[PDB]
Design a protein around this ligand. Structure first.
Ligand SMILES: O=c1cc(O)n([C@@H]2O[C@H](COP(=O)(O)O)[C@@H](O)[C@H]2O)c(=O)[nH]1
Ligand SMILES: O=c1cc(O)n([C@@H]2O[C@H](COP(=O)(O)O)[C@@H](O)[C@H]2O)c(=O)[nH]1
Lengths: 218, 219
């Protein structure tokens, strides 16, 4: 996956007008948008097709898929039917649940991203202690795309070590949650950024500023 | 606790509005509580909740297995309750802040959170099972009153019930298609969740009536 400027916009605004406007304002800087449940549950799955029509961006559906295999398969089918290029899946529910998603992705020409460790404080309670094993499970399953946390670069580095330099790694938590774009890109292929762009006084200037700060990494 | 008719919750995981409405209508004399998940919501929109309320007046549990950071969890809960869900199901494995975020929205909005502890599928044994007792204890500490645990592992369901106490409300999927037994499950759970063995039946009403007949002494 070739992500422009190593920057993925997390579009978590919950109003169609604002989401489209803000994405349009930063469109020259990105070609990849992460769309999650805040926007989808507020405006419908048809929002994905609308983003493709307006921006011709790739769409990662951040749905943190975390059900049994039967239900995971259905969620992935509905998601890819809506035009998502990729879907993010939790690893914590185990290998069969991940495989269910991989199967649908292969059938429909899409990608699965495996979420290993998360960026929030609560991730330390259960996820963190399982994360290396979840990453190894991904490797065993042939997963090529991973998500790990900007806010813990030592954990992000370990995740990179496990999956190898050939796998693709994206990372949320830079900006609002305190992560640093440049440090994160030592290990991740791309950073995910939401609020520090879409809540900024001037979203375009915010995106341009982030990119300026990592210019030597592009 | 919510008064679930016949201790039986329909898992409506059909992905077509016409079929989902037909089947739900057919079993309405037996079931007043319906679990709507992402297979239906992502296929037909959040307005499917509105449609179910309009047509059936059933309680709606939004099975969204909420599993994000606190900020995003809050947004998901707000959108879900705005659409008319009575309750939402939240994963415990992302930790206490993520659960608290959902509880705070539910409190503000006058709705309920169900905490999913252990899951029913084989993959649950890899990571979830070993965390489940602690996830349940965390729920009790946070003031969670409603829980989800697996029909297919009676021994685990019993332990979950012990942890949360007799006053907590516990619902349980895995009977029927996944092999769990309704009667045994209801030794510990307040209600069983049943999907495919009802909604794929030639006669979903007869399937529901049959399940209920088999547990009639427990009603
Ligand atoms: O560990 C994770 C995994 C995520 O997908 N995310 C997602 O990444 C985005 C982060 O947005 P922000 O830059 O506003 O903090 C949100 O959409 C969030 O749900 C995260 O923050 N941490
Ligand atoms: O551990 C769990 C938690 C669930 O919510 N579920 C949900 O309960 C339902 C089970 O349906 P069924 O009776 O067709 O097996 C599905 O909606 C599934 O997503 C489950 O099967 N196991």
């Amino acid at each position: 996956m070739d992500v422009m400027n190593r920057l993925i916009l997390a579009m978590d605004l919950m109003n169609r007008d604002d989401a489209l406007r803000v994405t349009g304002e930063v469109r020259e800087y990105i070609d990849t948008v992460k769309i999650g449940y805040p926007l989808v549950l507020s405006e419908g799955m048809d929002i994905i097709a609308e983003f493709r029509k307006r921006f011709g961006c790739r769409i990662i559906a951040d749905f943190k898929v975390a059900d049994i295999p039967e239900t995971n398969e259905k969620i992935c089918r509905a998601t890819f039917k809506a035009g998502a290029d990729a879907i993010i899946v939790h690893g914590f529910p185990g290998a069969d649940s991940v495989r269910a998603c991989l199967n649908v992705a292969e059938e429909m020409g899409r990608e699965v991203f495996l979420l290993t460790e998360m960026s929030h404080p609560g991730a330390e309670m259960f996820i963190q202690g399982a994360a290396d094993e979840i990453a190894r499970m991904g490797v065993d399953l042939g997963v090529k795309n991973y998500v790990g946390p900007s806010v813990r670069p030592e954990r992000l580095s370990r995740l990179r070590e496990i999956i190898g330099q050939d796998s693709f790694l994206i990372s949320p938590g830079a900006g609002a949650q305190g992560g640093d774009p440049g440090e994160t890109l030592r290990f991740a292929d791309a950073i995910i950024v939401g609020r520090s762009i879409f809540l900024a006084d001037n979203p375009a200037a915010a995106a341009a500023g982030i990119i300026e700060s990592i210019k030597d990494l592009l």
